[PDB]
Design an enzyme around this catalytic site. Structure first.
Site, PDB file in Angstrom:
ATOM      1  N   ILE A   1       0.852  -1.227   0.000  1.00 23.81           N
ATOM      2  CA  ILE A   1       0.000   0.000   0.000  1.00 23.81           C
ATOM      3  C   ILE A   1       0.873   1.258   0.000  1.00 23.81           C
ATOM      4  O   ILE A   1       0.563   2.183  -0.768  1.00 23.81           O
ATOM      5  CB  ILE A   1      -1.005  -0.014   1.167  1.00 23.81           C
ATOM      6  CG1 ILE A   1      -1.977  -1.190   1.045  1.00 23.81           C
ATOM      7  CG2 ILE A   1      -1.735   1.316   1.255  1.00 23.81           C
ATOM      8  CD1 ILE A   1      -3.242  -1.026   1.846  1.00 23.81           C
ATOM      9  N   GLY A   2       1.942   1.270   0.801  1.00 24.24           N
ATOM     10  CA  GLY A   2       2.829   2.447   0.857  1.00 24.24           C
ATOM     11  C   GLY A   2       3.372   2.695   2.253  1.00 24.24           C
ATOM     12  O   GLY A   2       3.027   1.929   3.169  1.00 24.24           O
ATOM     13  N   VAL A   3       4.194   3.739   2.400  1.00 23.93           N
ATOM     14  CA  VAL A   3       4.822   4.100   3.705  1.00 23.93           C
ATOM     15  C   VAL A   3       4.395   5.526   4.071  1.00 23.93           C
ATOM     16  O   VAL A   3       4.721   6.432   3.282  1.00 23.93           O
ATOM     17  CB  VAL A   3       6.356   3.981   3.637  1.00 23.93           C
TER      18      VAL A   3
ATOM     19  N   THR B   1       5.550   0.602   7.042  1.00 25.29           N
ATOM     20  CA  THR B   1       5.201   0.008   5.723  1.00 25.29           C
ATOM     21  C   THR B   1       3.877  -0.750   5.846  1.00 25.29           C
ATOM     22  O   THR B   1       3.770  -1.612   6.732  1.00 25.29           O
ATOM     23  CB  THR B   1       6.326  -0.898   5.206  1.00 25.29           C
ATOM     24  OG1 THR B   1       7.545  -0.157   5.253  1.00 25.29           O
ATOM     25  CG2 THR B   1       6.089  -1.378   3.792  1.00 25.29           C
ATOM     26  N   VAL B   2       2.924  -0.450   4.960  1.00 20.53           N
ATOM     27  CA  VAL B   2       1.578  -1.094   4.964  1.00 20.53           C
ATOM     28  C   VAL B   2       1.458  -1.954   3.703  1.00 20.53           C
ATOM     29  O   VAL B   2       1.759  -1.442   2.617  1.00 20.53           O
ATOM     30  CB  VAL B   2       0.465  -0.031   5.018  1.00 20.53           C
ATOM     31  CG1 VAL B   2      -0.913  -0.640   4.829  1.00 20.53           C
ATOM     32  CG2 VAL B   2       0.522   0.786   6.299  1.00 20.53           C
TER      33      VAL B   2
ATOM     34  N   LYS C   1      -0.366  -3.536   8.994  1.00 18.49           N
ATOM     35  CA  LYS C   1       0.564  -2.531   9.564  1.00 18.49           C
ATOM     36  C   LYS C   1       1.349  -3.232  10.675  1.00 18.49           C
ATOM     37  O   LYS C   1       0.714  -3.835  11.554  1.00 18.49           O
ATOM     38  CB  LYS C   1      -0.211  -1.327  10.105  1.00 18.49           C
TER      39      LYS C   1
ATOM     40  N   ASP D   1      -2.520  13.216  14.482  1.00 12.19           N
ATOM     41  CA  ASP D   1      -1.783  13.305  13.195  1.00 12.19           C
ATOM     42  C   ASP D   1      -2.782  13.266  12.040  1.00 12.19           C
ATOM     43  O   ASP D   1      -2.507  12.566  11.057  1.00 12.19           O
ATOM     44  CB  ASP D   1      -0.704  12.226  13.074  1.00 12.19           C
ATOM     45  CG  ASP D   1       0.300  12.512  11.972  1.00 12.19           C
ATOM     46  OD1 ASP D   1       0.060  13.450  11.198  1.00 12.19           O
ATOM     47  OD2 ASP D   1       1.315  11.796  11.902  1.00 12.19           O
TER      48      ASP D   1
HETATM   49  C1  LIG Z   1      -0.570   4.605   4.696  1.00 10.78           C
HETATM   50  C2  LIG Z   1      -0.602   5.195   6.080  1.00 10.78           C
HETATM   51  C3  LIG Z   1      -1.741   6.175   6.186  1.00 10.78           C
HETATM   52  N1  LIG Z   1      -0.811   4.141   7.039  1.00 10.78           N
HETATM   53  C4  LIG Z   1      -0.044   3.914   8.150  1.00 10.78           C
HETATM   54  C5  LIG Z   1       1.121   4.737   8.509  1.00 10.78           C
HETATM   55  C6  LIG Z   1       1.669   4.327   9.849  1.00 10.78           C
HETATM   56  C7  LIG Z   1       2.194   4.613   7.461  1.00 10.78           C
HETATM   57  O1  LIG Z   1       0.724   6.089   8.594  1.00 10.78           O
HETATM   58  N2  LIG Z   1      -0.491   2.879   8.821  1.00 10.78           N
HETATM   59  C8  LIG Z   1      -1.581   2.433   8.115  1.00 10.78           C
HETATM   60  C9  LIG Z   1      -2.431   1.355   8.380  1.00 10.78           C
HETATM   61  F1  LIG Z   1      -2.232   0.594   9.460  1.00 10.78           F
HETATM   62  C10 LIG Z   1      -3.487   1.086   7.507  1.00 10.78           C
HETATM   63  C11 LIG Z   1      -3.702   1.875   6.375  1.00 10.78           C
HETATM   64  C12 LIG Z   1      -4.803   1.487   5.516  1.00 10.78           C
HETATM   65  N3  LIG Z   1      -4.601   1.708   4.202  1.00 10.78           N
HETATM   66  C13 LIG Z   1      -5.593   1.321   3.370  1.00 10.78           C
HETATM   67  N4  LIG Z   1      -5.504   1.503   1.991  1.00 10.78           N
HETATM   68  C14 LIG Z   1      -4.314   2.166   1.529  1.00 10.78           C
HETATM   69  C15 LIG Z   1      -4.340   3.571   2.132  1.00 10.78           C
HETATM   70  C16 LIG Z   1      -3.465   4.548   1.366  1.00 10.78           C
HETATM   71  O2  LIG Z   1      -3.847   4.579  -0.002  1.00 10.78           O
HETATM   72  C17 LIG Z   1      -3.631   3.319  -0.616  1.00 10.78           C
HETATM   73  C18 LIG Z   1      -4.542   2.282   0.019  1.00 10.78           C
HETATM   74  O3  LIG Z   1      -4.308   1.024  -0.584  1.00 10.78           O
HETATM   75  N5  LIG Z   1      -6.739   0.735   3.762  1.00 10.78           N
HETATM   76  C19 LIG Z   1      -6.910   0.545   5.079  1.00 10.78           C
HETATM   77  C20 LIG Z   1      -5.956   0.903   5.996  1.00 10.78           C
HETATM   78 CL1  LIG Z   1      -6.240   0.610   7.655  1.00 10.78          CL
HETATM   79  C21 LIG Z   1      -2.862   2.960   6.085  1.00 10.78           C
HETATM   80  C22 LIG Z   1      -1.815   3.207   6.983  1.00 10.78           C
END
Ligand SMILES: CC(C)n1c(C(C)(C)O)nc2c(F)cc(-c3nc(N[C@@H]4CCOC[C@H]4O)ncc3Cl)cc21
Lengths: 233, 279
Positions: B9-11, B13-14, B29, B131
Site C-alpha cells: 500500500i505504501g509508507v 510500511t503497509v 501494519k 496526526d
Molecule cells: C498509509 C498510512 C496512512 N498508514 C499507516 C502509517 C503508519 C504509514 O501512517 N499505517 C496504516 C495502516 F495501518 C493502515 C492503512 C490502511 N490503508 C488502506 N488503503 C491504503 C491507504 C493509502 O492509499 C492506498 C490504500 O491502498 N486501507 C486501510 C488501511 Cl487501515 C494505512 C496506513
C-alpha cells in the site's frame, strides 16, 4: 441505550464454547478449573485487586480453553497468565509476573508466564477489553428503582455472586450479561427476604432485567436458581 | 487467518493482502514494541485492546481492525501485526483525481460531515488522532470516509509534515483534544483550494505561515509555557479566509475560522462543528 446493544454484541464475539471440556480439552477437567479459579480468586483477594480482574481472567481462560488444548500441568500457568493480562487491562498498578509466580510457590517462573502471555493474547486476537458481569450490573443498577444506599449493597452482593459463579462451569454457558442479571436478581431476592419493605426492585425483576438483555425470562430464572444453589454449598 | 500479501500500500510500511477465507482485501501494519521484564508493554496491551473494543460500535466513518497478532518475538522486541479492512484510496488521491473546477460544495459538506462524525466518535472514546492528514483520511469506492492510523501513539512512540499540526504542539505548550479540530480546518480549506493551506519546513516556519492568515495572537491569548516567544514573530494582521480559500460561502469561512482558532479552549469541537449552519 445504544452502548448496551454494543456490549451485548461484544460479548457474543468473546463467547467461550460450552463443549470445550469434551471437544477441545483432553486432560483438563472442571474440577481442575475450579481449583485454578479458586486459586485466582485467592490471589486477587490477597493482592487487593480491582473486583473485575478475577471474572475477566476467568473469561480469558474459558475462551483460550475453547481454542487450545492445554496439559493439566500447564493449567495453573494459564490461570496466572489470564490474571496477568486482566491486571494490565483493569488496574493502575498491574500484578507483576513474579508476584503471580510467588502464589504458585515459585513452581512457575516469570519467563514461562511471558511466553504464555503471547499465546493467550494471540489466541484471543487481542480482544482483551471483554465485557464482564460488573459492566452489566452497573447498567442494570441505574435502571433499577433503588436509593444510592441500596445500590451499594446490591453491587456488593451481586459481585460476590459473580465471583462464586465464575468458579463453576455455569460461567462458560451463560454470557456475562446473564451472569450479571442472575446475580443482581439473586442479590435483590436475598436483600428483600431480610428486609421485605426495602429493595422493592425484587418484584418481577427477572422479567424486568430480561427486557433489558432481550433474553428469555425462563433462562434468567434458571440462571438465578443455579447461582443460588451454588451459594448453599 | 494467514493473509497472503498481494501488493504494498505504501509508507511504517503497509501491505495489501487477500483474506484466505473471506477473500476480502486487508491492510497489514507492523509496529515494534519493547520486550521488557513484564513481557508485553502495558500501554501496548491496553491501547490495542481498546482499539478492538471500538469495533462493537460498528461506526461507519472509522477503519475496522479485524485481526491482531504478535508475529515476532526476540529478547529486545515484539512485532505486532494489525489487520484492517482495505480502503481503495486516501483523501489526497481523491482530491487530486477530481477534474477542474474542483469538488462540488455538496460533496465537500458531506465529506466534512462524515469526517466530523468519525472524529467525534474517537473524541467520545477518549482517543485523539494527533496526526490527522489527507493520507490517513481514507475514502471508500462508495464515497464513505473512514479515519485510520489512530490510538497507537504509545506503541508508535517506542521526517513527517507539520502542515496540519495545531499551534500548541508547534509551540510545545499543551497537547489536547482540539489539535485534531485545527487539522480539520486545514483539511476543510484544502478541499476548496486543492492544495495544503499551510506548508512549513520548520516548527517556527509553520507558525509564521499560520500567523500570515490568522494574524498574530495577543499576549493574553499566548500560552503560559512557550518554547518560542511571541516577540520572535513579526506583527501580522488577520487576513480574510476568502483571499486564500476560493469558492467558499461566508458561513463556511466562519466555520473554518472557528476550527482555525489559536486558543484551543475557544476552538470549535467536532460535535459543535456538526451542528454548524454550513453543515
Ligand atoms: C498509509 C498510512 C496512512 N498508514 C499507516 C502509517 C503508519 C504509514 O501512517 N499505517 C496504516 C495502516 F495501518 C493502515 C492503512 C490502511 N490503508 C488502506 N488503503 C491504503 C491507504 C493509502 O492509499 C492506498 C490504500 O491502498 N486501507 C486501510 C488501511 Cl487501515 C494505512 C496506513
Amino acid at each position: 441505550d445504544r452502548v448496551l446493544r454494543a456490549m451485548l454484541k461484544a460479548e457474543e464475539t468473546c463467547a467461550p464454547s460450552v463443549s470445550y471440556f469434551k471437544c477441545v480439552q483432553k486432560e483438563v477437567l472442571p474440577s481442575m478449573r475450579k481449583i485454578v479459579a479458586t486459586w485466582m480468586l485467592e490471589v486477587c483477594e490477597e493482592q487487593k485487586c480491582e473486583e473485575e480482574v478475577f471474572p475477566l481472567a476467568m473469561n480469558y481462560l474459558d475462551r483460550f480453553l475453547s481454542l487450545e488444548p492445554v496439559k493439566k500441568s500447564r493449567l495453573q500457568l494459564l490461570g496466572a497468565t489470564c490474571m496477568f493480562v486482566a491486571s494490565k487491562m483493569k488496574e493502575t498498578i498491574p500484578l507483576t509476573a513474579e508476584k503471580l509466580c510467588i502464589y504458585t510457590d515459585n513452581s512457575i517462573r516469570p519467563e514461562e508466564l511471558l511466553q504464555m502471555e503471547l499465546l493467550l493474547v494471540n489466541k484471543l486476537k487481542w480482544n482483551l477489553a471483554a465485557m464482564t458481569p460488573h459492566d452489566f450490573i452497573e447498567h442494570f443498577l441505574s435502571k433499577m428503582p433503588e436509593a444510592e444506599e441500596n445500590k451499594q449493597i446490591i453491587r456488593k452482593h451481586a459481585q460476590t455472586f459473580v465471583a462464586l459463579c465464575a468458579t463453576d462451569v455455569k460461567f462458560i454457558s451463560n454470557p456475562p450479561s446473564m451472569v450479571a442479571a442472575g446475580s443482581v436478581v439473586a442479590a435483590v431476592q436475598g436483600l428483600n427476604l431480610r428486609s421485605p419493605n426495602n429493595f422493592l426492585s425484587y418484584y418481577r425483576l427477572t422479567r424486568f432485567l430480561s427486557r433489558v438483555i432481550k433474553c428469555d425470562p425462563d433462562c434468567l430464572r434458571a440462571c438465578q436458581e443455579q447461582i443460588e444453589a451454588l451459594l448453599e454449598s | 487467518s494467514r493473509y497472503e500479501p498481494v501488493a504494498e500500500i505504501g509508507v511504517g510500511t503497509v501491505y495489501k493482502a487477500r483474506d484466505p477465507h473471506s477473500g476480502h482485501f486487508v491492510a497489514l501494519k507492523s509496529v515494534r514494541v519493547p520486550n521488557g521484564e513484564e513481557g508485553l508493554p502495558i500501554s501496548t496491551v491496553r491501547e490495542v485492546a481498546l482499539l478492538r473494543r471500538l469495533e462493537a460500535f460498528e461506526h461507519p466513518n472509522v477503519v475496522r481492525l479485524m485481526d491482531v497478532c504478535a508475529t515476532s518475538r526476540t529478547d529486545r522486541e515484539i512485532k505486532v501485526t494489525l489487520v484492517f479492512e482495505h480502503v481503495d484510496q486516501d483523501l489526497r488521491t481523491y482530491l487530486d483525481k477530481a477534474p477542474p473546477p474542483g469538488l462540488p460544495a455538496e460533496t465537500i459538506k458531506d465529506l466534512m460531515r462524515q469526517f466530523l462524525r468519525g472524529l467525534d466518535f474517537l473524541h467520545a472514546n477518549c482517543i485523539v488522532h494527533r496526526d490527522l492528514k489527507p493520507e490517513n483520511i481514507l475514502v471508500t469506492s462508495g464515497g464513505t470516509v473512514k479515519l485510520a492510523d489512530f490510538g497507537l501513539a504509545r506503541i508508535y512512540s517506542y521526517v513527517v509534515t507539520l502542515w496540519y499540526r495545531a499551534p500548541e504542539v508547534l509551540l510545545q505548550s499543551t497537547y489536547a483534544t482540539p489539535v485534531d479540530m485545527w487539522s480539520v480546518g486545514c483539511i476543510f480549506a484544502e478541499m476548496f483550494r486543492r492544495k495544503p493551506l499551510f506548508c512549513g519546513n520548520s516548527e517556527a516556519d509553520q507558525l509564521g505561515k499560520i500567523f500570515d492568515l490568522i494574524g498574530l495572537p495577543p499576549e493574553d491569548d499566548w500560552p503560559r509555557d512557550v518554547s518560542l516567544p511571541r516577540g520572535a514573530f513579526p506583527p501580522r494582521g488577520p487576513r480574510p479566509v476568502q483571499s486564500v480559500v476560493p469558492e467558499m460561502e461566508e458561513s463556511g469561512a466562519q466555520l473554518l475560522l472557528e476550527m482555525l482558532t489559536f486558543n484551543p479552549h475557544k476552538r470549535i469541537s467536532a460535535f459543535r462543528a456538526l451542528q454548524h449552519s454550513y453543515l
